[PDB]
Design brief:
Number of helices of chain B: 14
Distance between the termini of chain A: 59 Å
Radius of gyration of chain B: 22 Å
Helix content of chain A: 10-25%
Shape of chain B: globular
Strand content of chain A: under 5%
Number of strands of chain A: 0
Strand content of chain B: 5-15%
Strand order of the largest sheet of chain B: 1-6-7
Helix content of chain B: 25-40%
Keywords: cilia, microtubule, dynein, motility, structural protein
Order of helices and strands of chain A: HH
Structural class of chain B: alpha/beta
Structural class of chain A: mainly alpha
Largest interface: D-E, 42 and 41 residues
Organism of A: Bos taurus
Chains: A mainly alpha, B alpha/beta, C alpha/beta
Oligomer: part of a larger assembly
Chain A: EF-hand domain family member B
Order of helices and strands of chain B: EEHEEEHHEHHEHHHHHHEHEHH
PDB class: structural protein
Shape of chain A: elongated
Largest sheet of chain A: none
Bound molecules: guanosine-5'-triphosphate, guanosine-5'-diphosphate, magnesium ion
Entry title: Structure of the 48-nm repeat doublet microtubule from bovine tracheal cilia
Largest sheet of chain B: 3 strands, parallel
């Protein structure tokens, strides 16, 4: 096919197929994102995202 | 009372200037469209918004800022974004060309067509207001619109108003890496006209704010929109002694005797101390006896050079929040006993505190956890002479063939500035240190 | 309001100039009848960069199709998106010309040029903020790079600071598709280097080997390489029609790019291109795409980067990124590659990050480099004049119209004036 | 107030603290989320919200051993910046360790030292833990203490080891390590590291009847010793022992700073409750060669001084009865010019036992601490293992290829031979 | 972090390379489509040692294949687990080396050894920090040994302090495979002693005799032998991937093992290997591994360690276990032999432990040892080179390519260097 430098994919399908690794990516490598933090697991009573701390 | 003008000229500071106006509207009940949201509607008892805003009688509040840049793209998303329902649509001046880094494309060829319009608005705002205190001009040091085009709009207010203050909030050029290629040459352009007018600045770069994002923040590889919020916070801490009252509050006229020893050393640092996420704030207590030191850590200050080769001259620990003033001199007498924080020998005056009673202001949509305490650190230090030592030297190795001058001489600019400003830039770097070790 | 006036000339530029409008119209939602079909908002609000608007709610380009022989313009009128244009500016004639520079600027192109430039005059004098020109030609023949100097000479007589943006296909080393090619290519260097500011130089040979190695295409026809050139066409125009975080027009992409008034020639390149078989096997990042920008194979003009030092690399990024990743990983390519950049410039690179990328992948890119190493392209063509000129070969056509040998000797030095200055500034 | 700061170094030393900070945490009412489901201030900082955080810095150059701490069940305890990890292994090579590999991590590991100790009121020690075999258990700590002697001075540093057994060990290159972590850290060191673990293996066979222990099962007992030393800091007794007090007591001369340890009432769960563990029984159960945590023969050495430390329900007339039991008894040799012999220690609080362990809830306990005149004898033949390697200069090119001079070993050996002969000088009688 | 980059070479290399990536892939739970479909949690966090990620959660191995005959390349891809390597990494030559490295590295492979660094230098700068390399070959052939002496050599120039770990299969005592083997193993030692930090020696009759008596296996082809070398393959490398009480990676062995740096060849083995029929009847304990590991049946070299003395020995005991049983079993074998352990190293014996077994056994162990009488492996190769090179029996096929006569004696003295240094250190 002459056109693979601009393959025929919509924006929503492109985003949904590209965000393919749910949790495996950040565990198995440093899966960087533009402006995203790291979320270590925490107990239910202990750590709220923003409370009196 | 106690009002100030906030013009956002040049692309770098107008986009950080897009980031401050979320933060002010969150503190009070002002929505983006200016209506208090059908409850908590004030009768009119308080006047807390008067430092940065103003009132139209329908209930909508009106800000005080002006968005000018000749670029057409970057102002066009504040006429269509989430904040179009905020400003006054005569404040917004757009145009046709960018900087293209040419000094006459912000001062002789294109910036000369727009100067009656932009002067007739800073005087339009000021006649409505009662008693003025200073200016909040958001310009970086790189381009012909960041650094060429602030010198045109600084040189006309200072013959209009005379004795008003000046404050600035943007990005210093890093010594090692940058984006615009003519930036070694570029900053020295603004220093020929804006050293006898400018009384405030920014010391250091956006390079080191990446690394605070690495360590103290738990984020990995940030954008530029994280830059805009953290620079946007210290705007609301310097200007917090103008509408929020505490123990020791400073208006913006006192800083021209606090921080300017001789007529050519007039710039601060900026350091928000507890810049941490939830995952570390939960583990650690952050009292006054360490957030004073957290400001003086070699990591947390914003500097891309060694602080350990620097001698702090005039610090100003502007506190904020739930603080008690015995904790302060317990912390400062801790500091001046520490041998590593070397000072200036012939000024034991040095410190200058400011205490207030509002918390740190969070904005939703960020990394931050809520902390009860925070503190700014405007600090005039010694070590930054090394950073001006390389920047005019960055001019000096393309100085042989005079690369890139073919567009300055091409469009409206002469060669005559390029030697006189350098020796004047050499005059600026020698004058920290020709007084730096005299009285021994 | 960073505008561009378009033209086509020669057979080689007519096709890629026609295959320009296939790529740009898909970005912006336009249907060949002229109805806006795109669902995204941002396709419209800077459409007047390349387009007039037609009455009745319809859209229309801003270009002038011209060449002397009428097969090509009549070929595009029957083409895929033929019915978009305006029929008053097709200056096509049934007559021909035999790839001779002499007649096309003194006799046979002199009858045509007033009708040629009175419609470049039409679309410009009813404009808001004109900023540039875009003429797609090719370096070889007497019609392509003959007429490239015709359609630029009378322009600079009035436009003071407007920045022309042409695109030229160079002669390949190993093969030839015209015998009299050095005898006409250096004829345009007498005027183009004086006036052009962007010439995206293209080799035909390097276009095949990208298809052979990366794309694994055995058979790249002409439906391929135009669609490979067409990406760097609409990749430089991202900060002319779209929002972005680091914006620059064609002038800022000349004040940064141009150091001295005669070394201004651009090398194309498109990063996230891969064959179909190993596409799943490859995961792209900002570190991964910066390899394909800085790879030795992803350059449309064949030269050796390891025989020259880059003056100003300017890679434009498009999409949603981290911008430490933009700046920290475009220094790591400069720190690790030390001796192959000029020592008299401290920072050799400049990025440009956009907010909506061109369609096809999430994270697109386009890399534009201004090396020094393209003097080996200049050495061979300037040699091919003078070692063929020791017998006075083909002068008996061009001297029917007054192309004296006093001209063809001194224009060869104006090729070698360019060679002497890269040698002046490689060792500096 | 009366605190310490603990830094666990190396894979042999971080793995001490994983079972040690099990023990200190359960000895208070602290769940590792920090929340209870003022006397504990000797070790913990407290937030405003009510979170407990230990005074710990975890340092190693192999990222595996620290990573199990971060993802296990104690993730909610540590500030996750306290865990300091390398990225390449020290590889049993202090020429790699404290010359090349540790030279870039050394800024972070000191900036945590000051910041944990900028909070605290008044200190009297540090707690440092490694073996004598690994490179980062030999060299990095020398780098991690010579800067500590300069930056602190007189404030003490205390150390605890599990030396791998000199008769049978892991590495061939281990005598190259245990000489230079005794030589270079001789001048800085206060009360310091211990003897080997083969006696811990044997006492895990006869007194602890369960066969086949693991390193997890030994580290149950190693934390039992250390907490008894810091038992009086959290809880009062009728005799209280400060931790600076151990410098002046068990060190005869300031090139002899290795006073050993053992813990006598170790009993399996079946044999625990048939018998008395009386005050006179357990002190008589310290001074035999079989019951020691020390795999050297005490018959070779006249004892200089000893330190006894009772935990639980002890009446000190029994201690005076137990001290009178040993001196007049004829086999043991308290040394000729020292008639003092003993440092006493009592404490009311019972010895805590971790659930899931092989130990017993005993009413009384004692941690017998001593210095013997046989410590040079293990130091004698250790340099013989160092003699036999370095005669043909074997394995030296995996150190002298890395920044360290060729004749540096023979400086240390004759210095250690300056320690062996001058140690034997005090052992003779003086008429 | 401590990441390793793979290589393969020749006919033996692609066979033992493809079976290794059948082993270590199924250790992590990766199907041949490449996507992690396993249920465990301890496999992902250290899979970055040997695996890049293909986007979509597919895991691509950090491997690269090369042979000078492209048929042996494409046997791998059609196989069971050949669909995981990216096809851009299948570098190759087009004409066979013909058991001549005068051809394999001097003349034929020289155009290829230039280009195959580009795959090597790009898979091995995509790591944050580097620890080593791996390549599997044999010392009799021409395609995968002479190129194996050139793939090592260019690496040492640009990674001068990284621990290469190259795996060998040594020519046989009695049943030779090619006629020209003394012209190979005597000459593939000149560029293997001097520039390789880790090498293992494997004989094929030792691989046969372990399949003759202890296995009692009836008709196995080259299939299960390719597991047998793969059983001790990652047994060294397991402490990189999984936690343990007492860890030991490559640089802990490399410090410990080699007494003097011109002696870096080793005898591997594998401990819990029991017969198929009598698998049920044998309980497995920690001491029962040790006796089966130090007898001369599980040695994987056809040169007897009973006739010599050990220098340094380690063993790692993978799986959950107690470790008093490590100690006095290593005491047990150290004092069971006095003559077999040298005078001037008191403790000749090293240990290690991991907490995770191979997927298929309860608890396993491997062997490594460095024996004296392996100089009889060195003598026997050197003896069969004195016979052929006195009458110049096969010189002229290698001579005319560009390897003159003196280059076979220089590698012969260096080969007789290596037999000399074992005899002087043996008697002690
Ligand atoms: N915080 C923040 N900084 C930015 C952003 N965009 C650009 N910058 C900074 O702006 C600098 C560019 O130099 P400038 O002085 O702004 O150039 P300019 O005057 O805007 O020139 P023109 O773009 O042509 O108008 C870069 O070095 C960036 O650090 C942004 O979106 N956010
Ligand atoms: N009781 C106990 N002893 C241990 C443990 N881990 C290591 N050791 C002792 O440490 C000895 C080996 O430790 P080292 O030689 O320092 O190895 P390392 O800790 O990895 O040091 P480096 O290799 O330099 O990183 C063993 O023989 C043990 O006696 C443990 O978890 N518990
Ligand atoms: N990519 C591409 N190149 C072309 C096409 N047609 C001609 N060319 C190139 O044009 C070159 C010859 O010079 P040319 O452009 O014809 O000079 P002209 O006759 O004045 O147009 C040849 O080397 C061709 O490679 C086309 O359709 N596509
Ligand atoms: N373990 C193993 N060894 C093999 C296999 N196939 C061939 N070999 C070895 O390969 C050797 C022949 O060398 P070869 O690889 O053909 O040399 P080349 O022709 O240069 O590649 C023989 O001695 C075999 O022992 C296999 O499937 N498994
Ligand atoms: Mg701008
Ligand atoms: Mg270790």
């Amino acid at each position: 096919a002459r056109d693979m430098v601009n393959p025929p994919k919509p924006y929503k399908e492109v985003f949904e197929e590209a965000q393919a690794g749910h949790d495996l990516y950040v565990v198995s490598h440093n899966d960087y994102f533009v402006g995203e933090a790291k979320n270590r697991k925490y107990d239910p009573s202990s750590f709220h995202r923003f409370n009196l701390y | 009372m106690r009002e100030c003008i906030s013009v956002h000229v040049g692309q770098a500071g107008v986009q950080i200037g897009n980031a401050c106006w979320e933060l002010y509207c969150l503190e009070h009940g002002i929505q983006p469209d200016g209506q208090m949201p059908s409850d908590k509607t004030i009768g009119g008892g308080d006047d807390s918004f008067n430092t940065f805003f103003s009132e139209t009688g329908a209930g909508k509040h009106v800000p005080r800022a002006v968005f000018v840049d000749l670029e057409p793209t970057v102002i066009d998303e504040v006429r269509t974004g989430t904040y179009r329902q905020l400003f006054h649509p005569e404040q917004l001046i757009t145009g046709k060309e960018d900087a293209a880094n040419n000094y006459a494309r912000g001062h002789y060829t294109i910036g000369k067509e727009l100067i009656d319009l932009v002067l007739d608005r800073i005087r339009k705002l000021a006649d409505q207001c009662t008693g003025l205190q200073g200016f909040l001009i958001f310009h970086s040091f790189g381009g012909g619109t960041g650094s060429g085009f602030t010198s045109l709009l600084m040189e006309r207010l200072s013959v209009d108003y005379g004795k008003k203050s000046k404050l600035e909030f943007s990005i210093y050029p890093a010594p090692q890496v940058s984006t615009a290629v003519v930036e070694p040459y570029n900053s020295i352009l603004t220093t020929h006209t804006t050293l006898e007018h400018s009384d405030c600045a920014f010391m250091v770069d956006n390079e080191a704010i990446y690394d605070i994002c690495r360590r103290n923040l738990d984020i990995e590889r940030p954008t530029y929109t994280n830059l805009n919020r953290l620079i946007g916070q210290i705007v609301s801490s310097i200007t917090a002694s103008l509408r929020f009252d505490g123990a020791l509050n400073v208006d913006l006229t006192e800083f021209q005797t606090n921080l300017v020893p001789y007529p050519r050393i007039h710039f601060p640092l900026a350091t928000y101390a507890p810049v941490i996420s939830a995952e570390k704030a939960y583990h650690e207590q952050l009292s006054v006896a360490e957030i004073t030191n957290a400001c003086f850590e070699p990591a947390n200050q914003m500097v891309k050079c060694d602080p350990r080769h620097g001698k702090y001259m005039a610090c100003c620990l502007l506190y904020r929040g739930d603080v008690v003033p015995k904790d302060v001199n317990a912390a400062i007498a801790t500091i001046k006993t520490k041998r590593t924080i070397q000072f200036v020998d012939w000024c034991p005056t040095g410190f200058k505190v400011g205490i207030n009673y509002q918390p740190p202001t969070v904005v939703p949509g960020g990394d931050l956890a809520k902390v009860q305490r925070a503190v700014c650190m405007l600090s005039n230090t010694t070590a930054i002479a090394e950073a001006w030592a390389r920047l005019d030297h960055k001019f000096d190795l393309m100085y042989a063939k005079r690369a890139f001058v073919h567009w300055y001489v091409g469009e409206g600019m002469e060669e005559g500035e390029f030697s006189e400003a350098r020796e004047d830039m050499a005059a600026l770097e020698k004058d920290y240190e020709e007084v730096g070790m005299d009285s021994v | 309001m960073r505008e561009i006036v378009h033209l086509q000339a020669g057979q080689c530029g007519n096709q890629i100039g026609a295959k320009f409008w296939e790529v740009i119209s898909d970005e912006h939602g336009i249907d060949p009848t002229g109805t806006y079909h795109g669902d995204s908002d941002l396709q419209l609000e800077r459409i007047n960069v390349y387009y007039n608007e037609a009455t009745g709610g319809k859209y229309v380009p801003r270009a002038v199709l011209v060449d002397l022989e009428p097969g090509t313009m009549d070929s595009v009128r029957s083409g895929p998106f033929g019915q978009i244009f305006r029929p008053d500016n097709f200056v096509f004639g049934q007559s021909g010309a035999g790839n001779n520079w002499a007649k096309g600027h003194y006799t046979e192109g002199a009858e045509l040029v007033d009708s040629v430039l009175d419609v470049v005059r039409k679309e410009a004098e009813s404009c808001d903020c004109l900023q540039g020109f875009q003429l797609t030609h090719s370096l070889g023949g007497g019609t392509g790079s003959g007429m490239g100097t015709l359609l630029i000479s009378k322009i600079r007589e009035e436009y003071p600071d407007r920045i022309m943006n042409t695109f030229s296909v160079v002669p390949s080393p190993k093969v030839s598709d015209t015998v009299v090619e050095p005898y006409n290519a250096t004829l345009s260097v007498h005027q183009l280097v004086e006036n052009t500011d962007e010439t995206y130089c293209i080799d035909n040979e390097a276009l095949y080997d990208i298809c052979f190695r990366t794309l694994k295409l055995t058979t790249p026809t002409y439906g391929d390489l135009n669609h490979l050139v067409s990406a760097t066409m609409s990749g430089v125009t991202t900060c002319l029609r779209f929002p972005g975080q680091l914006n620059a027009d064609l002038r800022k992409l000349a004040v940064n790019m141009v150091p001295f008034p005669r070394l201004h020639f651009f090398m194309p390149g498109f990063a996230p291109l891969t064959s179909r078989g190993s596409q799943q096997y490859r995961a792209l990042t900002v570190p991964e795409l910066t390899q394909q920008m800085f790879d030795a194979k992803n350059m449309m003009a064949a030269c050796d980067p390891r025989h020259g030092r880059y003056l100003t690399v300017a890679a434009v990024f498009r999409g949603r990124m981290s911008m430490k990743e933009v700046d920290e990983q475009m220094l790591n390519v400069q720190n690790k590659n030390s001796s192959y950049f000029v020592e008299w410039i401290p920072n050799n690179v400049k990025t440009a990050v956009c907010d909506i990328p061109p369609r096809g992948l999430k994270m697109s890119a386009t890399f534009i480099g201004n090396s020094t190493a393209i003097q080996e392209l200049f050495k061979r063509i300037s040699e091919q004049f003078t070692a063929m000129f020791r017998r006075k070969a083909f002068l008996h056509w061009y001297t029917g119209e007054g192309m004296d040998e006093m001209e063809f000797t001194e224009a060869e030095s104006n090729m070698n004036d360019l060679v002497s200055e890269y040698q002046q500034y490689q060792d500096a």
